[PDB]
């Protein structure tokens, strides 16, 4: 730990990595081994989404499976081709209950 912090990082730690990013940038928590370190990014990597906060910009891991872009960690906005989107989640087949079926791609009725 012989050098200053990272490019877009204004508050740094040896252990914790980056603590605070430049206002435009996003902080992302990277788990490498035991360590969890802050890292400053211009954009969120795939798997993560753009959690737009008034206090800190975060890249948050999406937890929904077969999802390419999610509104939150458990709600999904768009599902990978060619899966159907029921209540925030992705399915290879519309769940049991009513269903879209063109119905362009989102499962309604309930």
């Amino acid at each position: 730990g012989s050098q200053a912090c990272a490019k877009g990082c204004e508050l740094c730690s040896e252990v914790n990595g980056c603590l605070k990013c430049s206002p435009k940038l996003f902080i992302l928590l990277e788990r490498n081994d035991i360590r969890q370190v802050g890292v400053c990014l211009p954009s969120c990597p795939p798997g993560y989404f753009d959690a737009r906060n008034p206090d800190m910009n975060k890249c948050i891991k999406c937890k929904i499976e077969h999802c390419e872009a999610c509104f939150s960690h458990n709600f999904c906005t768009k599902c990978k081709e060619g899966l159907y989107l029921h209540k925030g989640r992705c399915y290879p087949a519309c769940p049991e209950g009513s269903s879209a079926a063109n119905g362009t791609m989102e499962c309604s009725s309930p």
Partner: protein, 152 residues
């Protein structure tokens, strides 16, 4: 209220036997949690790592030992959670124990030991000085480590 912390590094041989290497360091049990023994896989948590929505970042197998290096209070003017809040969150997320590094934030000790509420069912331990530096050195260098918290 002394807590003995053993950090265990382990390696597997082809045969199937485990070789271990252990180092000791000391801390104190805090009133935030029970004064019980605990053992578990070490997981370092970033300050922001126990915050809202980030919590559900990843899932760990139940029974991990959270390790948190606290920053100087000016570097964290807007904490998402109190230290107690962080401990509680960690335990809710399957921590068998929580260890705080309070060298840069000694004041946190007072926040841990002086709480109006029910102490957690799991141990909350803090470390400082050479012990904290030792623990952090292990955390930084090693890929995997098991922690054993002993006494009282």
């Amino acid at each position: 209220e002394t807590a003995f912390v053993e950090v265990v590094l382990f390696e597997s041989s082809p045969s199937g036997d485990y070789t271990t290497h252990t180092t000791g360091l000391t801390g104190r049990f805090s009133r935030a949690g029970a004064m019980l023994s605990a053992e578990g896989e070490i997981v370092q948590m970033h300050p922001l790592g126990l915050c809202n929505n980030n919590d559900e970042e990843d899932l760990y197998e139940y029974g991990w030992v959270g390790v948190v290096k606290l920053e100087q209070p000016e570097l964290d003017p807007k904490p998402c959670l109190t230290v107690l809040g962080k401990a509680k969150r960690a335990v809710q997320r399957g921590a068998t124990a929580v260890i705080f590094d309070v060298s840069e934030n000694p004041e946190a000790i007072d926040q841990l030991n002086q709480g109006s509420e029910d102490p957690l069912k799991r141990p909350v331990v803090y470390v400082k000085g050479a012990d904290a530096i030792k623990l952090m050195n292990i955390v930084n260098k090693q890929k995997v480590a098991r922690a054993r918290i002993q006494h009282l």
